[PDB]
Ligand binder design. Sequence first.
Ligand code: HEM
Ligand code: HEM
Ligand SMILES: CC(/C=C/[C@@]1(C)[C@H](C)CCC(=O)[C@@H]1C)=C\Cc1c(O)c(Cl)c(C)c(C=O)c1O
Ligand SMILES: CC(/C=C/[C@@]1(C)[C@H](C)CCC(=O)[C@@H]1C)=C\Cc1c(O)c(Cl)c(C)c(C=O)c1O
Lengths: 379, 59, 101, 295, 79
Amino acid sequence: APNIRKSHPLLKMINNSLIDLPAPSNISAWWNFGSLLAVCLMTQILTGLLLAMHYTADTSLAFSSVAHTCRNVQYGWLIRNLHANGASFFFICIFLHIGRGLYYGSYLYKETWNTGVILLLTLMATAFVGYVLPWGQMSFWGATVITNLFSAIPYIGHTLVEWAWGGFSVDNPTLTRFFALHFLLPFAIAGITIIHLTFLHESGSNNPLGISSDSDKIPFHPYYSFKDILGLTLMLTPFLTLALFSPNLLGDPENFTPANPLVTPPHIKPEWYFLFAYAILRSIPNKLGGVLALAASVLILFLIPFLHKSKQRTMTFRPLSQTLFWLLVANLLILTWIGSQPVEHPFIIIGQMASLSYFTILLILFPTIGTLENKMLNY
Amino acid sequence: ALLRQAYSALFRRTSTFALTVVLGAVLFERAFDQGADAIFEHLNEGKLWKHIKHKYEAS
Amino acid sequence: GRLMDRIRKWYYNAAGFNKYGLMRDDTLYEDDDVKEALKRLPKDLYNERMFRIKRALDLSLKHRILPKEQWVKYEEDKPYLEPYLKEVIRERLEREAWNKK
Amino acid sequence: FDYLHATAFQGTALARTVEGTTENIKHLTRADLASYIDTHFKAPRMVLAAAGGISHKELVDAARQHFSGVSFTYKEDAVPILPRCRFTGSEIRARDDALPVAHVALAVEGPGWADPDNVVLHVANAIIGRYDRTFGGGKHLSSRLAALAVEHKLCHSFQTFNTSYSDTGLFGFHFVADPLSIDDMMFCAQGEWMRLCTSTTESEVKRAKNHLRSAMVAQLDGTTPVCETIGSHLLNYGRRISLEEWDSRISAVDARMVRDVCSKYIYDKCPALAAVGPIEQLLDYNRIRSGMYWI
Amino acid sequence: GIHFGNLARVRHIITYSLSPFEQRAIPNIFSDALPNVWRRFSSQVFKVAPPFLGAYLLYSWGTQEFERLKRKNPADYEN
Ligand code: HEM
Ligand code: HEM
Ligand SMILES: CC(/C=C/[C@@]1(C)[C@H](C)CCC(=O)[C@@H]1C)=C\Cc1c(O)c(Cl)c(C)c(C=O)c1O
Ligand SMILES: CC(/C=C/[C@@]1(C)[C@H](C)CCC(=O)[C@@H]1C)=C\Cc1c(O)c(Cl)c(C)c(C=O)c1O
């Protein structure tokens, strides 16, 4: 009363978080990844279930069940595709969603940010174990290496590896507790996503110029609802052009060979979205160091909010930070290439560089150039 | 004037607007389907089993 | 010396916030001090700063800028908030020090 | 209301204030006022009206005597036709969060004196009527909007209006409210318009008619008022429209009629909006626009 | 919950706008649109492109240099 849009304990929510929501009138297309990320989640989850209804978590049957799911299940092949490629477009989107945040100082929204980082770690874990279910060559050796990471912890380490496998070497128990794990996580994602978006709402969205947009807000609907429908049909076009015309473009082919506990393929590389870390791991020629570097390669995201020195929020008006920012992007773009190459010269050296480069541009440069820029404005 | 005839008869009333989207989606489908299949089969003459077919059939 | 004094003018045109009609001080990110400062701005100075910003945003939604003529010029940029803010941060350091003391 | 015209008829003659600009008043010369009187204050365009205890004859005589200007060419006896004014669905938002209350006006283009529909439109405006803080009726007022207004403290006052002109018009409503209730008011308001186009009953119209009939008689409560009616009837409707006639037209109206007509000028139309004051809570033309369809 | 009415204090600002049905969806595609698409491209292509073009070389180099190390140097078996 009056309208049943603002009073109803439920609709007051659909309305109070996506229809009457105060949105800056100038958010650019770099703000459309939030929804695309969201949409993925629902799409992934849906196609996922459809598949879970034909998968069979057991070494002696995992591979052939996926194979059957495709060749026999009506449209199974399409669903398999959509699910596998959605994993990619999900990462693409999450990466741009992150950059945007970095380039426009959205990380100043600490909780909204930290939850985000948590989301990223979760999505990664998820996409990882999903990749293991078909029990192919990568599936197996992937499972072997990653669970082996804990072995880097002193004392326990190995102990922790026993659980992870459920035995004394990857096998069936690992496969089933992974399927359980994969089935579960996506929901925890959806759950946290809700918190992410709740912390957000306390403050409101940020905008390109990085100055209060209270003087000019607009109702999410129809402005951004329409803008998001459109931003959807765009991501959707290459996602489908890819999944329909060139299915395996984005994916490693080693997973077409049923796992062999005795043979590690010579060209063993992770799913494309992990390469950059895989690259850093192989830089440090020491067990524990490579592990720590790897961990920090993502965990470093938690430090960003604290390494902000500029007196301005975004890099729209900071040409030096910009260059450094774009130099950082190309920096990652390189590590990805490195990760897709063997551990031989010139690669090994180029690698250690880009890594060293990565951690410096973030821990030392950015906060420095930032301070510098402040003085150039006379602050 | 179709735009006016249409607006006045179809797009104005939010109820008739729906009937149009349905009635329309039906026609659009049946036609867009033939067309595309027609385009595709043509682009692959004599390669589909629809073509080879007569060689081992009956008559 | 007159070194970073011409560098400043360069950087100023580099930033480009003047293309929107914003004074260097209209771009400051609103932390706690800045917020206090702004509350101390005289009625008119505040209403002007507001329009400048509400206009820059409208520009940004349209994806345009001001015709070259209207751009702020390095020497005509009024640091309308700088002094207030200085004081706010001043009063604060006093308190901070006085409480550990 | 000026800002309303100012944008509703933007780009034309009607979009001008009656008082005129500041620059005009600061510079208008003896010449212009003269020329204005000369060009406009002319016999064919004037009407000597009067009412009370007077002899029509004795009046016409006094007229022939002092109201004596002569006409030679056809030009002098010609009543110019004005260049049509274009209605534009738009808005003008004058914000000042320092004003105590906010004012909002919304309207669609009206038909213009000539059209018989103006009757129906006024019946329509009766169903919604008006309200203000001092009405004793309160929560029991027959006007659905007045009730809600009372129930939820939507405003300080609101009023429907059917301003007519020669060839065009303005049909809408105006309300005053606190910064924090503009939204709901606007919401309920459009709501009541849509009810007009879609679900008006016979009970609502019956009362609407009786309310109009009485307003129509109070129109003629004095010699000044009766003289004003006569002055503006000839000048606008051509002749004089009797109460007996008006009443016949007002009785002819019913539900179906009101719906068909309000649907004609209100449904899915792009309205003109004018907001003044601390109007932040009211927002987006796009939204207000969507309030123009589906009850 | 609701933030429309609290947001901020604003005075003396008039804004005029027109219904969407009275105006053009994508107006001045040539005289206005494209000019700015170019305007923007220009201002930015030199902060962006550089580091990318840079990594590109590092890519082509390290690539061709890894290929060169595959080939044999005659000076090994000319004995
Ligand atoms: C499951 C993953 C995620 C989903 C579905 C998601 C979704 C969203 C949505 C819908 C928005 C609002 C619209 C927008 O601004 O994009 C948002 C905003 C934001 N997200 Fe995420 N997010 C995810 C992950 C992350 C990650 C990994 C980070 C951090 C590294 C992050 C940082 C932010 C921040 C800072 C905002 C505020 C954006 C702004 O300043 O406008 N998000 N997110
Ligand atoms: C966070 C969203 C999701 C992501 C990131 C994701 C990702 C993946 C990945 C990377 C794979 C391997 C794809 C391949 O064959 O190359 C996969 C497979 C699979 N996922 Fe998911 N998944 C998601 C949600 C779900 C959920 C919730 C279910 C079911 C309710 C599900 C069920 C499966 C099954 C059965 C497979 C194995 C068979 C196959 O590969 O087709 N997934 N998933
Ligand atoms: C996930 C989503 C929208 C989703 C859909 C699903 C709507 C519920 C209905 C119509 C659609 O198709 C949208 C894609 C929006 C995310 C989202 C947010 O959470 C928030 Cl706080 C903001 C400020 C924006 C701004 O643009 C946003 O896009
Ligand atoms: C990129 C990576 C690990 C990433 C994790 C473990 C983050 C450090 C934390 C969050 C996660 O869940 C990711 C999966 C490990 C490197 C890595 C791989 O990814 C994969 Cl598939 C394989 C087959 C190997 C083989 O040697 C590997 O070394």
